[PDB]
Design a protein around this ligand. Sequence first.
Ligand code: Y01
Ligand code: Y01
Ligand code: Y01
Ligand code: A1AIB
Lengths: 36, 129, 157
Amino acid sequence: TGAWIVPAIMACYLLVANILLVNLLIAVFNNTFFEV
Amino acid sequence: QPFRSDGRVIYCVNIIYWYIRLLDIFGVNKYLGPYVMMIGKMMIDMMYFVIIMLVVLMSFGVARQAILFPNEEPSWKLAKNIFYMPYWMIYGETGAWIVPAIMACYLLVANILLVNLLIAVFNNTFFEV
Amino acid sequence: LGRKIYEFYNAPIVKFWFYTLAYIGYLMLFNYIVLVKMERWPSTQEWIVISYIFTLGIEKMREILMSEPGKLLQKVKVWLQEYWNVTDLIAILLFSVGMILRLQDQPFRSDGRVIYCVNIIYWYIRLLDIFGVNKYLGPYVMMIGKMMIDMMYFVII
Ligand SMILES: CC(C)CCC[C@@H](C)[C@H]1CC[C@H]2[C@@H]3CC=C4C[C@@H](OC(=O)CCC(=O)O)CC[C@]4(C)[C@H]3CC[C@]12C
Ligand SMILES: CC(C)CCC[C@@H](C)[C@H]1CC[C@H]2[C@@H]3CC=C4C[C@@H](OC(=O)CCC(=O)O)CC[C@]4(C)[C@H]3CC[C@]12C
Ligand SMILES: CC(C)CCC[C@@H](C)[C@H]1CC[C@H]2[C@@H]3CC=C4C[C@@H](OC(=O)CCC(=O)O)CC[C@]4(C)[C@H]3CC[C@]12C
Ligand SMILES: Cc1cc(NC(=O)[C@H](c2ccccc2)N2CCCc3ccccc32)no1
């Protein structure tokens, strides 16, 4: 009936877990290259 | 036989070079030539990266092989384990907490440091050529 | 000929290459004593690693004694201002604790083996300080140094 709160959790997990934070990390480690 | 299998293996390792040899021709293409020279610079860059990658990675691998499987007899299969098992350790898993610190540092320094260092290195080498 | 030998072996580059060949041998013997069996009494390959750690401890004591300031606490603080000296001392007391636990019977031998297995990690990481001098590896070592602080601030988020 209302078993749809869980796929929203997996959907936000896929949205913010790798696809945000990992690309933030290559961006951070790319900016620190030329400064040193 | 069994020298026919050795000749087949030598043919099978020669076809690799006879495919790699096409990069010298590709070196003349206005769009492939920069990529061939980029492979040429990235070979030296990855060669210098490989020492730090080994120092980071096979030390843990030795740590995993000395924490787990504590009864491995002296044989040459130990070296094959310590540079084959951590190569495929993606799917692998009172005071029994020293091991999760090892996995935690492994996840911290193995991919999430060295791989991003590698896209950073290969991104800096783009505009210079 | 003796003057030539003494002039060769007192050179700093010769000392550096001799010292890193002795490390490479130390890493080899430490890998051997963490992969092969370990009994009530240590083998030759483990007594060599024990003697390695004890002679470095004596060398670090000579670094404590033979330095520039005259006060003992002042020269101790000056030597401990460098982070690598701190982690080297931490590894020396860690190895002596692991050896003392290993010299006892079971289950303390497993604890000594675990302490050896966590000390080999630092004794591989210590090579980054040497790599810091390579014209091509030194930038990468400093990049690891900045990326440690960057990943530490990233880890909270
Ligand atoms: C840090 C990087 C650059 C190199 C790491 C090298 C190690 C992975 C090697 C170097 C010394 C090797 C050991 C040297 C000697 C032996 C004995 C060998 O057994 C025999 O030769 C049987 C006969 C006998 O000696 O009794 C089995 C492999 C083993 C443990 C080797 C396992 C792999 C080791 C630890
Ligand atoms: C900077 C330098 C000191 C690095 C080079 C290290 C070598 C000088 C060491 C490392 C491994 C050592 C060996 C490790 C084990 C043995 C076996 C040991 O013999 C036994 O234990 C029983 C007899 C046997 O079966 O050999 C005799 C010494 C020997 C050859 C050692 C001789 C000295 C070696 C070659
Ligand atoms: C000059 C720099 C690059 C250092 C070179 C170090 C090597 C000369 C050492 C380091 C590890 C040593 C090995 C470590 C352990 C063993 C096992 C040892 O065999 C045993 O302990 C089993 C019993 C037996 O002796 O038969 C024989 C010597 C050997 C191969 C050693 C031979 C000498 C090695 C290769
Ligand atoms: C045990 C053990 C450790 C070790 N090596 C060092 O920890 C280090 C070193 C590391 C790599 C290459 C060369 C030397 N080293 C040895 C002597 C004391 C000392 C002083 C200042 C800086 C380095 C250094 N050898 O056996």
